[PDB]
Design an enzyme around this catalytic site. Structure first.
Site, mmCIF file in Angstrom:
data_model
loop_
_atom_site.group_PDB
_atom_site.id
_atom_site.type_symbol
_atom_site.label_atom_id
_atom_site.label_comp_id
_atom_site.label_asym_id
_atom_site.label_seq_id
_atom_site.Cartn_x
_atom_site.Cartn_y
_atom_site.Cartn_z
ATOM 1 N N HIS A 91 10.765 -20.478 -7.926
ATOM 2 C CA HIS A 91 11.312 -22.038 -8.946
ATOM 3 C C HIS A 91 10.862 -21.417 -10.109
ATOM 4 O O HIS A 91 11.490 -22.951 -10.849
ATOM 5 C CB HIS A 91 10.410 -22.899 -8.490
ATOM 6 C CG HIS A 91 8.999 -23.236 -7.776
ATOM 7 N ND1 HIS A 91 8.315 -21.686 -8.212
ATOM 8 C CD2 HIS A 91 8.307 -23.940 -8.272
ATOM 9 C CE1 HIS A 91 6.865 -22.351 -8.020
ATOM 10 N NE2 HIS A 91 7.130 -24.358 -8.228
ATOM 11 N N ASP A 133 8.035 -18.149 -0.964
ATOM 12 C CA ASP A 133 9.019 -18.307 -2.646
ATOM 13 C C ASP A 133 8.377 -17.791 -3.353
ATOM 14 O O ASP A 133 6.885 -17.674 -4.326
ATOM 15 C CB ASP A 133 8.470 -20.384 -2.554
ATOM 16 C CG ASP A 133 9.750 -20.640 -1.847
ATOM 17 O OD1 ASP A 133 10.493 -20.712 -2.176
ATOM 18 O OD2 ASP A 133 8.457 -22.091 -1.377
ATOM 19 N N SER A 154 2.377 -23.232 -12.532
ATOM 20 C CA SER A 154 2.741 -22.676 -10.443
ATOM 21 C C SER A 154 2.549 -21.521 -10.981
ATOM 22 O O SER A 154 3.508 -20.165 -10.986
ATOM 23 C CB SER A 154 3.871 -23.576 -11.030
ATOM 24 O OG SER A 154 4.614 -22.437 -11.154
#
Lengths: 158, 158, 158, 158
Positions: free
Chosen positions: C35, C57, C109
């Site tokens: 992402h 992910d 992140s």
């Protein structure tokens, strides 16, 4: 040092109000750049006939009645490093002259470059911007003794 | 000594993974080895068109405006004796350049060899192991000033 | 301890505007979040191919030649509580990850969590929101060693 | 004084080898001259789309996030004279911006003239050396507050 010998020896080129270049006597010959327009001072040598050289961007003529004295003299012996000038110091390296950036412009396009003994090795004509130190488009004399014009690329007449 | 002079004049080339050989700028001309692949770090001279000289294993080109502060003057006058170097000291005994045994390796094949006064006399390409004091292949200049190579024995080009 | 070890190991990702994520080199593999979008720095490591694991992910790939000194081995053994972290300290009470409220956020992140011995134990990808102890959605390794995805309810990925 | 004041706000414009102009952050506007050619630095303030003016010889745009730091208030409240500058002090005697001789060269065609309270008053574009003292062609704001140009005769961009 150098200015005390250049003063009253190198003659300005008046454009009727301001100087455009300078004219110098070397070896008994008066010479001034071809791209510089105007009239040189003092009547004793202002009426001297000058003939064009075109390729050398110079016009040369013989100064009369004072060729014995007031001669700057010229020498082809050019050991590199630390030559003097009316605007300070120019350096010789790899067959090319360098001066610090910023100094030099219109009105300085005919000044000679002297030695430690008051001997001319150069007659400055133009210059090219080279980032940190600018090169000088200049007529000089090679090892044999013949006049040669060295021009860095993109050299305006200052 | 030599590291201070070679700093900000010798520009390394990376293969997009790591350095694989420096590139020198001498006499207003960039030159890098043929066998060294990849782009150079300094982006101003990374876009200059480079001409091959595959007899000498060098791409060469003209720097845009870095004529001073990247001059790094070269002379062909190479008296026998000791010369400074990026890693250690090199010698010009019997018309050849020899480095100590272990020094020198892959990715370090564009390094100039300077003089006592800071004049490059040599450009390193490769080398061979001649026992102790290994010699190294190098691009130099002869007495007349014409570029020549010195490739002794089976010099593996690093 | 944590700040020194995470230096030159957490490689920031830039979306050409700012840092917006971290990519981590563990176990001889690069991995970054899906992402996060942009270009990883360290252009040596930016040129490797990354294959997508959309289940966890992540994009993961083989690292370049830097095998030694860049391992950063992971640990499946997870004693509960008192783990160090880039922005502070995390906790492993009741099989979940808790941080003081207000830490983290967008652009963070992918930072790893290290043990007392410095070994990596977890790589976060997002976070939930409890009133006092904020939760973290994370890629960890199970007690058998297989990688697992621990995500609490309402995990904002940022 | 003003050298520190306009720092990190006066972003220079690259000629791809050097700096050929300056760009200003005024009211969220990326103001750069049109005659100054090349690429602006940074990436936050370089990827935007600028709109030409061609009557004031500027180009303007917007910053996406830098409004917190895009703090250079323009002000037309202007007593006649004694204003600071990047290089020295400028004078607005006789309704004309004036500077001493010499200072101002290539690479200095886009930097602001600040106030006594750190407010942008003028954006320099060119100059001419005539009259009693040299004067500047410059974009300013009139009494009513609309953008106006003040240009001497023969005012080529330095």
């Amino acid at each position: 040092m150098c200015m005390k010998l250049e003063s009253d020896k190198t003659f300005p080129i008046m454009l009727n109000g301001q100087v455009n270049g300078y004219a110098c006597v070397v070896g008994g010959r008066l010479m001034k750049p071809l791209h510089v327009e105007g009239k040189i001072d003092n009547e004793q040598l202002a009426a001297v006939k000058l003939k064009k050289a075109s390729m050398y961007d110079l016009e040369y003529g013989d100064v009369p009645q004072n060729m014995k004295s007031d001669t700057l003299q010229y020498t082809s012996d050019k050991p590199p490093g630390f030559y003097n000038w009316h605007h300070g110091a120019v350096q010789y390296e790899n067959g090319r002259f360098t001066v610090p950036r910023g100094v030099g412009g219109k009105g300085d396009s005919g000044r000679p470059i002297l030695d430690n003994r008051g001997r001319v090795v150069a007659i400055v004509l133009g210059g090219a911007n080279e980032g940190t130190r600018t090169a000088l488009s200049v007529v000089t004399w090679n090892q044999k003794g013949v006049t040669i014009k060295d021009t860095p690329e993109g050299s305006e007449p200052w």
